[PDB]
Amino acid sequence: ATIGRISTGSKSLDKLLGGGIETQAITEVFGEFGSGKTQLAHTLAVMVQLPPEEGGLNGSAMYIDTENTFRPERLREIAQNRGLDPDEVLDNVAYARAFNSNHQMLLVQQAEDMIKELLNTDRPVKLLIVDSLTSHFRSEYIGRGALAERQQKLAKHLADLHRLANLYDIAVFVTNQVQHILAHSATLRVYLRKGKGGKRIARLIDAPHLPEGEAVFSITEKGIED
Numbered sequence: 001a002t003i004g005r006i007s008t009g010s011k012s013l014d015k016l017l018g019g020g021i022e023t024q025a026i027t028e029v030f031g032e033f034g035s036g037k038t039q040l041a042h043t044l045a046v047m048v049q050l051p052p053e054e055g056g057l058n059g060s061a062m063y064i065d066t067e068n069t070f071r072p073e074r075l076r077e078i079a080q081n082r083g084l085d086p087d088e089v090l091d092n093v094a095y096a097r098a099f100n101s102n103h104q105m106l107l108v109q110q111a112e113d114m115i116k117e118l119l120n121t122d123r124p125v126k127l128l129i130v131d132s133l134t135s136h137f138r139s140e141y142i143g144r145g146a147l148a149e150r151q152q153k154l155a156k157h158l159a160d161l162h163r164l165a166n167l168y169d170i171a172v173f174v175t176n177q178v179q180h181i182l183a184h185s186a187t188l189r190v191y192l193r194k195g196k197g198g199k200r201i202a203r204l205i206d207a208p209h210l211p212e213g214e215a216v217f218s219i220t221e222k223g224i225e226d
């Protein structure tokens with residue numbers, strides 16, 4: 001099945017990504033607090049709703065939050081400043097707080113139910129966001145031997161997410177706070193940091209056959225743009 005691409009709002013970042021965030025893939029964006037990772041998540045939750053000539057997939061989004069970073073009014077702002085109805089856009093973002101890592105796993109199973117329900121409608125789910133994906137795993141699996149167990153549980157969670165992406169042709173977008181020898185299993189990893197002039201800088205990590213470069217973007221009333 002053809003890979004779909006969701007624009008980030010930034011032409012620079014989209015170029016680095018080969019046109020946008022891919023369906024049938026997990027894209028991980030990681031960095032310090034304020035690096036742009038959560039602003040990008042909010043922006044994508046709007047962009048996915050647009051038609052493809054505007055960089056979207058005519059879809060809806062599901063946003064799983066682990067550290068209370070979801071801001072409904074930020075979504076409404078991004079929508080309004082892109083010519084969209086804020087309330088309709090917010091209603092197309094299904095939100096859930098994950099209370100712990102086991103609940104986070106159940107929420108992914110519930111996401112599958114919603115994806116199946118909407119799959120053949122005019123607005124399928126096309127984006128699943130997990131913000132600060134590792135935060136509960138890091139607090140719960142800690143101490144001697146926790147590295148192996150945590151990594152096994154994370155790998156299983158990521159395998160479940162990969163299955164949804166591949167089976168239902170959706171993009172999975174995950175964020176993490178930055179922590180250098182641990183394994184990772186996202187399809188594509190993107191490091192974000194602050195740069196000069198209020199800009200954020202993006203770099204692909206461990207993607208040897210994707211072209212060499214860095215993207216530059218801003219955080220604005222439209223979410224993310226150049």
Ligand SMILES: [Cl-]
Pocket residue numbers: 033034035036037038039040
């Ligand atoms: Cl951010």
